[PDB]
Amino acid sequence: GAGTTTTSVTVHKLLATDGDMDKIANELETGNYAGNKVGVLPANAKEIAGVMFVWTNTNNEIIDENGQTLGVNIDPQTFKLSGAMPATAMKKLTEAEGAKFNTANLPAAKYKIYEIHSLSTYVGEDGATLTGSKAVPIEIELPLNDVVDAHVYPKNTEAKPKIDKDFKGKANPDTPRVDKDTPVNHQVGDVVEYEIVTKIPALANYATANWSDRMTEGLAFNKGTVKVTVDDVALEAGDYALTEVATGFDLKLTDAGLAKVNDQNAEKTVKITYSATLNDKAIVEVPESNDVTFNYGNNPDHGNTPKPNKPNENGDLTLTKTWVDATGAPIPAGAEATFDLVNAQTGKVVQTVTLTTDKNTVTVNGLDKNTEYKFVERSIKGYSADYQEITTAGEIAVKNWKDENPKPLDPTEPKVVTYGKKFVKVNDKDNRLAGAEFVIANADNAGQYLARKADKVSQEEKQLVVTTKDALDRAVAAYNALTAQQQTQQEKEKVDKAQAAYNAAVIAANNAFEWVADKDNENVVKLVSDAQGRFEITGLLAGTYYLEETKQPAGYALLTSRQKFEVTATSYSATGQGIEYTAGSGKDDATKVVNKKITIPQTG
Ligand code: NI
Ligand code: NI
Ligand code: NI
């Protein structure tokens, strides 16, 4: 005999499906006299499970079921706990018909019951979380007058955040750009400026709020360009933890940071801006992309964004899944796990795979070994996706944490793409000529010549260019000092090998472009024909350019004219251009550059 005549209390957690909790109260007022089970609920309220309730004494100190204090306090204003939830605390999660506490051993007194957002599992429709609350904490003095089995009705609203990522200026969470997947033409060295705009509801109660971005290889994330504002106002050094990696970043609100978006009177607007440079690994007509995820919850969250990866040499790529609980400790497979294999350059779905509870891995074959892909986990209720950092080609690992948080926000991303042109050097009988050197101009007659910016190329890159150039010079000279019959496949390979090395060196040196006056300058992009007469230019914006030959094939004359050419969205790959880049390939994807040769005749 220590407790009271009120031997049980049941907490029913009510959700205001509209925004009106006051209206819920203004039906429970007029309905009751004392605290018995309400037979029927307002049309405006709904009872939800998965909300955690814990008992306190009148001073906000957590108690066990005999009313003993447990030396952890809860702040009456923020609801924040001063320690870890004590193991023997009188706490329980609501089930469909509420949380029924046994109150039989509690001494006569005043008590509080709090909602602990941070320890609940509830998740609304379309990933909404509980925001505002009315009549929390519950103040109940025991015994409840006349009642032995009491029932109480704490109230809540729920809300959802919104997001979109797009180029600087274009980001709109309410109506994302519909033609986003359409790549925008850019040249190498361009700085791409991105914008992330997140709307966070009023009275948010986030424990986590992390943004994570990962980029395909052809985009270099520009470190130190990240800026974050909340309603236009810059966050402070201590409001977030920013970690920067070669392929992008993770941005996490701290407690001071969350303070600024949580428990606020109006929808709040978070903006994160930053840039990336399209670099020398961009493959022509192959989009590059960023990819952001927003991982949030009333409970802490461990999910993040996928990491693109390439298949191994065999065109094989393997996903491997592991599972853990909110503390990081191993647990058995939570459920079926479905993933979409997305081509990471384009943003399009390659195929779908499912992992049954018993088989934690899957391998997909027949993939392009030059193409980056990602397995995007389809939302598993209760579970957040942690994509592990990439250590090797052909392997992607995913860890499933049982946070019990809403599905993450995953905006679509824009794309960017460079264009290019291919050529073959021939005589008038289509014989492929080696060693013809070319530069690119911006007019048929005067104008400037294409170069890489001096300030955007190091000395190592520069000398590799001249070293391979010199090397090529020698191979061409040797091949030219042979005769028609002696210039067989094996000898042409020699020239092809050297020209390939040169060509890669230029592509690597071409980190940026500028137009200049002098064709003699060292930075001028020079193109050279291989023994199959081939040369290409990659990394360009669309437009009209003009080849100028600077040194003709041995035995031939110098062209006294520039050759006009068009760079387009398909000029690098389109068939029907007049000649095979590589003989016998079946695709005439190049333009012929026809050299002339003066001959001295005879008579009689
Ligand atoms: Ni690539
Ligand atoms: Ni995304
Ligand atoms: Ni480079």
3-state SS of 67-91 is CCEEEEEECCCCCCECCCCCCCCCE
Distance 158 CA to ligand 2 centre (A): 24
How many Å lie between the centroid of ligand 1 and the Cα of residue 251? Answer: 26
- Residue 275, class by beta-carbon neighbours within 10 Å (0-12 exposed, 13-18 middle, 19+ buried)? middle
Six-digit token pair at 171?
Answer: 């980001």
Cα 235 from Cα 270, distance rounded (Å): 10
- 295/377 Cα distance (integer angstroms): 13
Ligand 2 centroid from CA 198, angstroms = 13
Among 293, 311, 301, CA closest to 400? 301
Angle at 12 between CA 9 and CA 14, to 5 degrees: 155
Two structure tokens written together for 574: 């389109």
342 exposed, middle or buried (CB, 10 Å; 0-12, 13-18, 19+)? Answer: buried
Cis peptide before 332 (omega within 30 of 0): no
Q: 325: CA distance to ligand 2 center in Å? A: 25
- d(CA 269, ligand 2 centre) in Å: 19
Q: Which residues are placed with Cβ below 5 angstroms of ligand 2, an ion?
A: 291-292, 410
| Distance of CA 412 from the midpoint of ligand 2 (Å) | 5
| C-alpha of residue 305 to centroid of ligand 2, in Å | 8
Which residue segments constitute the domains of the chain, with CATH numbers given?
1-159 (2.60.40.10), 160-300+408-418 (2.60.40.740), 301-407 (2.60.40.1140), 419-603 (2.60.40.10)
**Residue 200 CB neighbour total at 10 angstroms:** 24
Report how far ligand 2's centroid is from the alpha carbon of 520 (Å): 46
CA 561 distance to own-chain centroid: 48
CA distance 529 to 437: 7
CA of 281 to the centre of ligand 3 (A): 8
- State the distance from the centre of ligand 2 to the C-alpha of 157, rounded, in angstroms: 28
Q: Quote the tokens at residue 244.
A: 């920067």
Q: Which ligand is nearest to the CA of 288?
A: 1
CA–centroid distance, residue 456 to ligand 2 (Å): 31
- The two structure tokens encoding residue 382: 């209760």
Dist. CA 169 → ligand 1 center (Å): 27
With residue 547 as reference, give the H or E element that holds it: strand 543-551
Element (H, E) at 324: strand 317-325
CA of 457 to the centre of ligand 3 (A): 7
Nearest ligand to the CA atom of 465 = 3
CA distance 404 to 383: 6
Q: Angle 169-170-174 (CA atoms, 0-180°, nearest 5)?
A: 125
Q: Measured between alpha carbons, how far is 205 from 129 in angstroms, rounded to an integer?
A: 8
- Judged by its nearest atom, the ligand closest to the C-alpha of residue 219 is 1
Q: Give the resolution value in Å.
A: 2.4
Q: Which ligand has its closest atom nearest to the C-alpha of 290?
A: 2
Residue 20 Cα to chain centre, angstroms:
37
378 CA → ligand 1 middle, Å: 26
Question: What tokens appear for 322 in the block?
Answer: 């592991």
Q: What single-letter DSSP state applies at residue 456? A: G
Q: Which segments within 6-108 are labelled E, that is strand?
A: 8-11, 14-16, 45-47, 52-57, 61-63, 69-73, 91-93, 99-102
Sign of torsion over alpha carbons 136, 142, 147, 149: positive
> What kind of experiment solved this structure?
X-ray
CA of 301 to the centre of ligand 2 (A): 17
Residue ranges of the alpha helices (H) in 234-320? 255-259
